[PDB]
A paper describes a structure:
The γ-tubulin ring complex (γ-[name]) acts as a structural template for microtubule formation at centrosomes, associating with two main compartments: the pericentriolar material and the centriole lumen. The γ-[name] has a helical shape consisting of 14 spokes, each containing a copy of γ-tubulin presented by the C-terminal gamma ring protein 2 (GRIP2) domain of one of five paralogous γ-tubulin complex proteins (GCPs). The GCP proteins interact via their N-terminal GRIP1 domains in a specific order: the γ-[name] core harbors four pairs of GCP2/GCP3 (spoke 1–8), followed by a sequence of vertebrate-specific paralogs GCP4/GCP5/GCP4/GCP6 (spoke 9-12) and finally another pair of GCP2/GCP3 (spoke 13-14). The inside of the γ-[name] is lined by a lumenal bridge composed of one [name] molecule, as well as two α-helical modules formed by the microprotein MZT1 ([name]) and the N-terminal extensions of GCP3 and GCP6 (N-GCP3 and N-GCP6), respectively.
After having structurally characterized the universal γ-[name] adapter protein NEDD1, we next focused on the conformational plasticity of pericentriolar γ-TuRCs imaged in purified human centrosomes. Computational particle sorting revealed two distinct γ-[name] conformations. In the first class, the overall conformation is similar to the isolated vertebrate γ-[name], and spokes 13 and 14 are positioned outwards from the helical axis (outwards conformation of spokes 13 and 14). In contrast, in the inwards conformation, the CM1 module binding site on GCP2 at spoke 13 was vacant and the γ-[name] harbored CM1 modules on the remaining GCP2 subunits at spokes 1, 3, 5, and 7, suggesting the CM1 module binding to these spokes is associated with partial ring closure.
Numbering used by the authors:
A (entry chain R): 8 to 21, 28 to 41, 50 to 84, 89 to 101
B (entry chain U): 2 to 39, 50 to 375
C (entry chain S): 12 to 36, 40 to 54, 56 to 72
D (entry chain P): 3 to 16, 30 to 49, 66 to 80, 82 to 97, 107 to 118
E (entry chain Q): 24 to 36, 40 to 53, 56 to 72
The structure:
């Protein structure tokens, strides 16, 4: 299942060599992440967006979470 | 085992092959001939042995039954003389030629149930059985026998009648052609007895040259292609370019005064008559069957010739099973032995219920 | 009924995630990433995505 | 021939009556039935579970690059 | 060539069976795998 999902992601991003490299790479808290995101937003500033992000984070909890936030922060 | 053995009978234009389903080879093979004085009827080898005092009949001369009275005698012979079984005690799988008239299929069915009282029967196309024997359900079969040759495209187990081609050029014609060129060489093979000798020379020393002209040049400038053949009286004769000139007629029928396309072109034409979406499957699965496809070198020659006719991007593959001389019979043995095929037999009950025409629905 | 409610919740969560991505900045790629993240690591996935983007360029 | 090869395979898997029964079963199975990316996916699963063995498998596949055979092998696995 | 294929087969999972299977493949693949599984079940 996970391997199939990784192959689908590689196809969306784009071949076989790239998929092999991705497989090799794969083979190779929440509050802190939120604070880091706010600090990154401050560096970018801006302030209004940070307030909106705090409201959005609360909404997600109302409707694992740390891993998704970390990936988004890395993309920046 | 609860079931009695089922019989498999391959009706050939020149030779009939009979045996039991499940076996790896037919138990008997005999000439498709019936003879009467010039014991009232002679069938098979005996008719041939005593042909001197008989008038011979060939009821299935070109693959299609033309005289049902004598065909019935061949079947009687098959059961009681060759296989030594009672047909009313065993299901019987029979083979038929490609493009066999619908009326003939009903006749065969009626004869099995009404004359031989078979408990069950079925009829399958020869080419289809050969394809089955090769482990395929899709492909094109080039069946070259004694009195006829056919190119039969088959898709998912079903022969495609619109794309089937018949070539009235086979083993018999090649034997006579060899008699003719050996006679032109300086020998003399013209009698019926001599025809049998040449048929043997043909089956033992002939081959298909990869390149006709080059082979002719080699034979003209050296004795490297010559082979000796000893007659029963001890005389040893020499066969040279006749070895490959004989079967060359399959690729160039004009050598026989025939305007027909050679076997490679006929195979190509059949494929081209099929839906474009399955042509690549046919090109990649061209299967050879029949005694006349036994010539050494024929597979490589077909590969070369088809490649020349087909698109350069086409993948061509010729399959020539070592046991292709009896692949029709073997395919029947395999089919009749399949678990899923048992429900397909036409039972005496079904025959009594629907009559001869049921064969069209049951044996599509 | 219960299945329909679950589908609505998943759609709402996806919309909220997309808004967060836009602020820190597609939907199909985000859905694939979210499924992979749920299974299991996060830093390694980010590195692979960056490498794939470089290859596309 | 192809028919001879099928009989040989049945004998290896497997007196005369038993061999005939095995051949009939194989024929019935065949009637019922009637690449590189897949190998990489298998390697990824091995790596997650080991890593040295997965690297060797990838190297062997590269050396080989038949395809059909590989596919068959994968299926078997 | 054949030896390399045998090593790959061992990692995925005898030698005579692999050689026979390779010859059959040279002479579809999914169907052959199903037949081998059926034969193993029959032997059991
Ligand atoms: N090894 C061989 N080489 C060439 N021709 C052969 C060989 N063996 C048999 N034949 C020829 O094949 C023909 C018979 O083949 P077959 O498929 O049994 O025909 P049919 O079914 O029409 O009777 C005969 O003409 C015979 O001479």
């Amino acid at each position: 299942s996970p391997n199939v999902l990784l192959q689908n992601l590689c196809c969306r991003i784009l071949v076989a060599q790239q998929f092999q490299y991705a497989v090799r790479v794969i083979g190779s808290d929440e509050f802190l992440v939120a604070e880091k995101i706010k600090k990154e937003l401050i560096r970018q500033r801006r302030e209004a967006d940070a307030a909106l992000f705090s409201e959005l984070h609360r909404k997600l909890h109302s409707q694992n979470k740390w891993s998704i936030l970390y990936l988004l922060l890395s993309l920046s | 085992d609860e079931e009695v053995a089922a019989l498999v009978v391959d009706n050939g234009s020149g030779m009939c092959k009979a045996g039991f389903a499940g076996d790896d080879a037919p138990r008997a093979v005999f000439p498709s001939i019936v003879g009467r004085p010039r014991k009232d009827s002679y069938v098979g080898d005996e008719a041939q042995s005593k042909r001197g005092i008989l008038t011979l009949k060939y009821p299935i001369e070109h693959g299609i039954v033309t005289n049902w009275d004598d065909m019935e005698k061949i079947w009687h012979h098959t059961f009681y003389n060759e296989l030594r079984v009672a047909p009313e005690e065993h299901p019987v799988l029979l083979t038929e030629a490609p493009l066999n008239p619908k009326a003939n299929r009903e006749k065969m069915t009626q004869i099995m149930f009404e004359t031989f009282n078979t408990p069950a029967m079925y009829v399958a196309i020869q080419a289809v059985l050969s394809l089955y024997a090769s482990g395929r359900t899709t492909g094109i079969v080039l069946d070259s026998g004694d009195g006829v040759s056919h190119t039969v495209p088959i898709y998912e187990g079903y022969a495609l009648p619109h794309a089937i081609l018949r070539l009235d050029l086979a083993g018999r014609d090649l034997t006579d052609y060899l008699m003719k060129i050996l006679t032109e060489r300086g020998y003399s093979f013209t009698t019926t007895e001599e025809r049998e000798i040449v048929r043997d020379i043909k089956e033992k020393l002939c081959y298909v040259a990869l390149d006709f002209e080059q082979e002719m040049a080699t034979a003209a400038s050296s004795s490297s292609l010559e082979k000796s053949y000893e007659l029963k009286d001890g005389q040893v004769i020499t066969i040279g370019n006749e070895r490959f000139r004989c079967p060359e007629a399959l690729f160039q029928p004009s050598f026989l005064g025939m305007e027909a396309c050679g076997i490679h072109e006929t195979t190509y034409n059949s494929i081209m008559k099929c839906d474009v979406d399955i042509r690549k499957d046919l090109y990649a699965n061209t299967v050879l069957s029949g005694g006349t496809t036994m010539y050494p070198g024929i597979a490589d020659r077909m590969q070369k010739e088809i490649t020349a006719l087909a698109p350069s991007t086409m993948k061509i593959k010729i399959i020539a099973p070592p046991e292709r001389k009896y692949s029709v019979w073997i395919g029947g043995s395999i089919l009749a032995s399949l678990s899923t095929f048992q429900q397909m037999w036409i039972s005496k009950q079904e025959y009594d219920e629907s009559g001869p025409s049921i064969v069209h629905r049951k044996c599509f | 009924a219960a299945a329909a409610a679950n589908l609505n919740a998943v759609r709402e969560t996806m919309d909220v995630l997309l808004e967060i991505s836009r602020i820190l900045n597609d939907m199909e790629t985000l859905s694939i990433c979210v499924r992979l993240c749920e299974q299991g690591n996060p830093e390694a996935l980010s590195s692979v995505i960056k490498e794939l983007r470089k290859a596309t360029e | 021939s192809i028919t001879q090869l099928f009989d040989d395979l049945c004998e290896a898997l497997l007196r005369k009556r038993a061999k005939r029964s095995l051949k009939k079963v194989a024929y019935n199975a065949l009637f019922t039935n009637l690449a590189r990316n897949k190998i990489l996916m298998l390697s990824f699963d091995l790596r997650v579970g080991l890593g040295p063995k997965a690297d060797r498998l990838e190297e062997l596949v590269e050396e080989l690059e038949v395809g059909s055979v590989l596919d068959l092998l994968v299926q078997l696995a």
